[PDB]
Design a protein around this ligand. Sequence first.
Ligand SMILES: O=C(O)CNC(=O)CCCC(=O)NCc1ccc([N+](=O)[O-])cc1
Ligand SMILES: [Zn+2]
Ligand SMILES: [Zn+2]
Ligand SMILES: [Zn+2]
Ligand SMILES: [Zn+2]
Ligand SMILES: [Zn+2]
Ligand SMILES: [Zn+2]
Ligand SMILES: [Zn+2]
Ligand SMILES: [Zn+2]
Lengths: 219, 222
Amino acid sequence: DIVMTQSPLTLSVTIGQPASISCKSSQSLLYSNGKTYLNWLLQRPGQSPKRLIHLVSKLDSGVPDRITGSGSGTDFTLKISRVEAADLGVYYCVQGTHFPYTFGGGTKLEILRGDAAPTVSIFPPSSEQLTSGGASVVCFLNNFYPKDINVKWKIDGSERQNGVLNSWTDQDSKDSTYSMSSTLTLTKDEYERHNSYTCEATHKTSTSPIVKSFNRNEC
Amino acid sequence: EMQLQQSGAELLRPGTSVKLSCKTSGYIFTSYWIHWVKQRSGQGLEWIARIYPGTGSTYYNEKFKGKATLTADKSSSTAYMQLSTLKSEDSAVYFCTRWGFIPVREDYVMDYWGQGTLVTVSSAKTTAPSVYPLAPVCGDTTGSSVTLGCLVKGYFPEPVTLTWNSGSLSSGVHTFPAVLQSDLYTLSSSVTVTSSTWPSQSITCNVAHPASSTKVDKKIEP
Ligand SMILES: O=C(O)CNC(=O)CCCC(=O)NCc1ccc([N+](=O)[O-])cc1
Ligand SMILES: [Zn+2]
Ligand SMILES: [Zn+2]
Ligand SMILES: [Zn+2]
Ligand SMILES: [Zn+2]
Ligand SMILES: [Zn+2]
Ligand SMILES: [Zn+2]
Ligand SMILES: [Zn+2]
Ligand SMILES: [Zn+2]
């Protein structure tokens, strides 16, 4: 089977700048009829893939000509002349010259924007949950950029690594930022034995850790 | 308007089989090849097979011979793909697509795709989630704007449906991807509103879990 190699894995580009993606195949994609069946697809976040180009450089109907394709033999390139917000997603090259059809690994295009510090919110366990003998402390770190962030949980000044469940959103189309959720789950009994619960983030936008905490007590 | 609608998410037991459907409309079903593609853990697609509904002619990727069987019902304009003896590798999202290559013209017509069908191969039992309201104490973000949340935990399998005020509230919400842990998924969503909205008017978290026929609304009270 033809191995299709795409580089780079990810590219961060600012709106208005050009972007190019490379695709290499292990066999020439020149079919015996002289045509080269190399296609490019875009899979936007939460959407099905969509073909942008066919036959190396032919645009599909309704595709903007900001997008251009080129190459031959085993080397192909997709170029976006001016990146717009709607270009966010994973780009894949797929060959149709040699059966069976094979895809490249994909290239994620991320919109490079101005740094944004996280908005951190912390939530103690709900009454409903405590009733069940469980306790989850949640921390939302919303709208930050770059995506790189490290969050630790500290209970009464000591780092807690067990019981932590983290989740991140894909880059937001509306503002190009990322959001993350971190949940620390303990038993109701242990939760009630400690006082200070701290959600601590490490991010480029700060020389010191970004902290959000609460102290439980009674009243 | 050309449309391809695929069937719902499937939870399948190891070793059994499933039949996925791809109902089409808006075009002459018999005149175009229908292809099936597989996607595992994001970036990484695989071409499975294609069928010409007009003749029933099918071509398979060697890898999938014996795994997939494509059929098509002309009277209903529905393509089907049956997957047999499911194993770990079969857990994935499957798409059907009227790819659009016209062999006679050696050129392409627009490609239309189905929304995808998620297949989970597991022997784990279906479990209804617990929905917990997250009212701030420190997740207040002071005045101006306050952010509320909804914690959905302990359910299986995916997916779960989460909206705010029946969909009325869609801007400023962040729904995080579910994470599996100890055979149960946990998912959360945050919503940021102006201090003038909450607690004044109510914010409600709506959750639906088809697999267990669970539908729950949690009102975020102070
Ligand atoms: O097989 C041969 O030798 C001759 N080649 C042909 O007839 C060309 C076939 C048309 C084509 O572009 N196929 C590639 C392809 C098809 C479907 C697809 N998808 O994702 O659905 C992705 C890629
Ligand atoms: Zn060949
Ligand atoms: Zn061949
Ligand atoms: Zn050959
Ligand atoms: Zn201690
Ligand atoms: Zn102590
Ligand atoms: Zn303690
Ligand atoms: Zn020509
Ligand atoms: Zn064309």
